[PDB]
Paper text:
Most pathogenic Gram-negative bacteria transport haem across the plasma membrane using an ATP-dependent active transport system, the ATP-binding cassette (ABC) transporter system. BhuUV-T is a close orthologue of HmuUV-T910, which is a complex of BhuU (TMD), BhuV (NBD) and BhuT (PBP). We successfully characterized the structures of the ABC haem importer, the Bhu system from Burkholderia cenocepacia, and showed that both BhuUV-T and BhuUV adopt an inward-facing conformation in which the periplasmic gate of the haem-translocating channel is closed and the cytoplasmic gate is open.
The crystal structures of BhuUV-T and BhuUV were determined in the nucleotide-free form at 3.2 and 2.8 Å resolution, respectively. The structural characteristics of the channel, in which the periplasmic gate is closed and the cytoplasmic gate is open, allowed assignment of the observed structures of BhuUV-T and BhuUV to the inward-facing conformation. L177, L178 and I181 create a hydrophobic patch and the cytoplasmic gate is open, as shown in Fig. 2b,e. The diameter of the gate is 13 Å (L177-L177 distance) and is the narrowest part of the channel, but the gate is wide enough for the haem (∼10 Å) to pass through. However, the shift of the coupling helices and BhuV was also small (∼0.5 Å).
Author numbering:
A (entry chain B): 25 to 133, 140 to 358
B (entry chain A): 24 to 134, 141 to 359
C (entry chain C): 1 to 10, 13 to 56, 59 to 167, 174 to 263, 267 to 273
D (entry chain D): 1 to 10, 14 to 55, 59 to 112, 119 to 167, 174 to 263, 267 to 273
Amino acid sequence: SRRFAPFVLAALAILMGAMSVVALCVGAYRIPLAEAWAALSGDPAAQQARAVLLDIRAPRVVLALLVGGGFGATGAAMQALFRNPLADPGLVGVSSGAALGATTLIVLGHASAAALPVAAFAGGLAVAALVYRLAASRGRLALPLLLLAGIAINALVGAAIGLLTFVADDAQLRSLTFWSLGSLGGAQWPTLAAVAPCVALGGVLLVRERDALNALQLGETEALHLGVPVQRLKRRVLVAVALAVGALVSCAGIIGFIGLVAPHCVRLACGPDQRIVLPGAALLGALLTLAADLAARTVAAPADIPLGVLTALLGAPFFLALLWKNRG
Amino acid sequence: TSRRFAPFVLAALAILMGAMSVVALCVGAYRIPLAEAWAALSGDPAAQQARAVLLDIRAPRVVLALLVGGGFGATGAAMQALFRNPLADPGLVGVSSGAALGATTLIVLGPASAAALPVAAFAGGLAVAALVYRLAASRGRLALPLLLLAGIAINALVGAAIGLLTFVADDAQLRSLTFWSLGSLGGAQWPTLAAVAPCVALGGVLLVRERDALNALQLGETEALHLGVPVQRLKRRVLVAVALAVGALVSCAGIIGFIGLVAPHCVRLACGPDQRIVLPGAALLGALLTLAADLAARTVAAPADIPLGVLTALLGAPFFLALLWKNRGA
Amino acid sequence: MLTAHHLDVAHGTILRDLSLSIEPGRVTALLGRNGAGKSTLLKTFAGELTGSVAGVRVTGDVTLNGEPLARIDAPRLACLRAVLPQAAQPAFPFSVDEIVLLGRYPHARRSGATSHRDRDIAWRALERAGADALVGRDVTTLSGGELARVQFARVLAQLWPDHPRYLLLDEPTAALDLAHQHRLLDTVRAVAREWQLGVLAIVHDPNLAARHADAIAMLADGTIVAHGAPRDVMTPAHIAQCYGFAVKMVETGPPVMVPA
Amino acid sequence: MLTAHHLDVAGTILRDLSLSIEPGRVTALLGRNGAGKSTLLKTFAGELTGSVGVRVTGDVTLNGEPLARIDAPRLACLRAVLPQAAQPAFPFSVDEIVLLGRYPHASHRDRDIAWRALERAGADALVGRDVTTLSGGELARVQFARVLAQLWPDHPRYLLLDEPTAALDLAHQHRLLDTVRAVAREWQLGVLAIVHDPNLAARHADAIAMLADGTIVAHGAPRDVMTPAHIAQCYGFAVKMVETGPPVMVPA
Ligand SMILES: CCCCCCCCCCO[C@@H]1O[C@H](CO)[C@@H](O[C@H]2O[C@H](CO)[C@@H](O)[C@H](O)[C@H]2O)[C@H](O)[C@H]1O
Ligand SMILES: CCCCCCCCCCO[C@@H]1O[C@H](CO)[C@@H](O[C@H]2O[C@H](CO)[C@@H](O)[C@H](O)[C@H]2O)[C@H](O)[C@H]1O
């Protein structure tokens, strides 16, 4: 009635697309747009510029869109499910799992080279599932008890990660340290051939729950009186999150404030209705990450800055801003 | 109006800690029975080398474990009172991050005096603990929610600087960072304890001088203000005292690790929230638990010397698993 | 009717051999001191304690228009009863329009259709809640009194007549100012009479229950110790055992309870 | 005499407000939600005049001297506030809570007073219990005993109730208000209490002040103030009065 923001959505879309083009035309391997268009058009003189665009630079752009989109949408969903803007897709323990999955592989062994995201993926989901099972009671899931189960399993996980880091050598240390810092330098097409449908699915389960999510943000008991299966929905949202965020962190490492920032902006821009906030967040998420990952590729080139670093230089003024906002 | 018959609980822990402490000197990498170890530390000319291994290599490590445990136990008790919440960790002040910023700034930007590392961690610890305070306080009212929000934001910025510096670190620097970041008492030497201990004791003194005001503040902030507690001065005095003790400790132990949550929580469940019991109670139990944890590292996988943070996390995990099982239904 | 017959709820038993019936068209007010079990009994009529939700054990019959509550899906149940709770400060800053529309959630066909009838009902419910001035507003700039009119709007929206239902009020009337409290219980009675709706409302002030209730159930220690019209039930001996409070009655031009 | 004369508080939520709490007597403060009842109470308590971002003007005096000039810890021995019983962050024993009433004074005569405070509030069976096993009614009784412990006499002080009657049951909110007056009288003590139910204040106050949109609109004994037109311009609520042989307010 009082809320016409589908132009906000459509704007975020245009800005995202626009940013995508801009990311494809910059910058480390120096290609002027004229060689960029010739390369895409099949000119044999631009044969190497084309391989860069399609084999190095396109997979990183599409991965940045998947990462940012996946974190915005699961931030949107977590914060509705916990009715707190501070809930973060990691609370399931997927993030620690992936860390533990990845770092036990880097430090023990073995196989290669798409083995790193599979270990990270199975580690996330397993720690996710364990954290769930410890909190649920067959079958009622309290969200306070989810947090305690999380604090506890992340304690256990973190020790196993600490022990591996300890017995690791200098090569293996170099790998953990950078794996956990975040990166998209890996990105190639076979990787995100797998990841993309994983987070494509998660986003479908989440959009399929948006109306039940809105009722939920009114009251757990209130949603229950309106007919929402509050127990079945917690389990449904949590799986979908653990699924897209699991696939994501498995091949990007740990990042990094986007799942908090993007939903909170669209919620400030358009209100909390899950029907707008999830696409809005996914959209603004993908936009902010691409922008971040672009800056990492080029701000200090040929250094490739971990993008965990840049997305924190985003969360810092954001949290500093909503400090300044809420002084009263 | 009776009481709860605590002080024996206090006395026991002091004994148990003291006992354990004594045995700690005899079971490190150098094995020596109580008899020969007594004789050596007491001047027996036959054991001049044994006195050197005990008084120079073992003792500073055992003493550091007592300073760390007692330090975290007591500052946690204070912060959990201050925030009226058993989940406040001493870290939240800002100090842990600044230690890790200052420690990494120095390891990675070399252009080594063994007093250079703890002094850097201590300056960064206090600076970012002081910067977070200024961002939250408005000259001069300190809302604890805003302190937490400044912390989130200043913590994001310091992790940006840390990962940036890690990213550029060579192999030797990376090996320091991760070792320091897993927590270890293996850097414990007397010249630095000379500096760390008075900090921890002075932080310790300033908290004790607030045990009554903190008890009144457990009643409600406005309730305590009505009782005459200057709750704004109280918030700042605890934070500067916590920042000073934790900052000293992280400076030479690294990141550890659950004690300041666990210890003041068991002492409470045994004797109630009375700050007059809990703050010395938690420090004794913290010293007892930390030492039990470092005795565990130097032992369970001998001769490896396992990071202490790893062992204190293996206390946290069962502690929070116990919390969970206890608060089912509720 | 909405009926408990020989109800037990159980940590010992909080409700012991309780038998009460909510009649369509009539408003039953529920009295009892703190801890008497009022809020449990109401949760029980909601169906929060019977079905695929709970460990608390329940015995005896509870019936909505003829069938055991336990056989009524939470979706279907959301169309025969609604619950007006209390501490409505929302977790996110919805609009008023959105809160009320959420009451049409159990009816919205596709899943969250937001059809045109639904926006009309939402407007007409805000109309009868007396909250139509608040169209547009952020629910977090609303005084507790305004918000309380909006939550009433939303619960009407869910019960709106269409193509006998039950309204359960969980102390809706407290922390409203005087004029407000009488306004709401008058409208509730009117709606109950006009839509043939069964109302059970937990009310604190027994004098307030006396003016606006057709029936009163005084609940004392897990059991209903008086039931019937405000005239017969409201007596010194009854107020005595229900509340432990020595009172007397006094007349007007409905009779009022007074201490000493 | 705890007095507010031409008191303004800031928009502005109290406009030119003059009222006086006087020893031995219980004034009851009536108004609808958002009338500034709680602001004025905080003002008397000294929360908006010491050192602690809003604007306050006019004289507020406690036994002659201005509130703006009285330290918080000395002010704590001249008044206390009953805030409606909240369960603390951690599980203190009932004794520890009451003794905390003695914090501004701090022992030995303390344990004696804490007992006699706990007794006057009818909360002495509760000794050694954990406050988190207590019902809100017992918790209310214990909080009352803590405030009495604070104002206890030894060798004119003030008690402010910020809606303590709240959600105590009918018979217990009557006991509490009665026992306040009984203590107000014996210890010669000025009581200002925010009461919800106007009939509750009729039956237990000595003076009733009505608050309408930031300012006072009536002040006197229940008999003279409890009129349909005062209840009208205070509550926007049309009532009549009925006798008893304490006349009670009724709508229509
Ligand atoms: C809601 C989600 C929306 C986000 C959209 C992201 C979807 C991405 C799915 C990945 O699909 C990939 O597409 C590539 C197209 O290039 C294929 O590479 C193919 O082409 C490459 C170069 O063009 C070659 O290097 C490869 O060998 C060849 O497999 C690759 O196999 C295929 O899996
Ligand atoms: C409740 C909280 C309070 C707990 C207090 C913690 C107790 C720590 C005391 C620190 O004091 C140190 O004691 C050492 C005793 O050995 C001294 O070393 C002395 O002995 C060393 C052993 O060889 C020599 O190397 C040094 O030169 C010589 O100063 C050292 O200087 C001194 O600063």
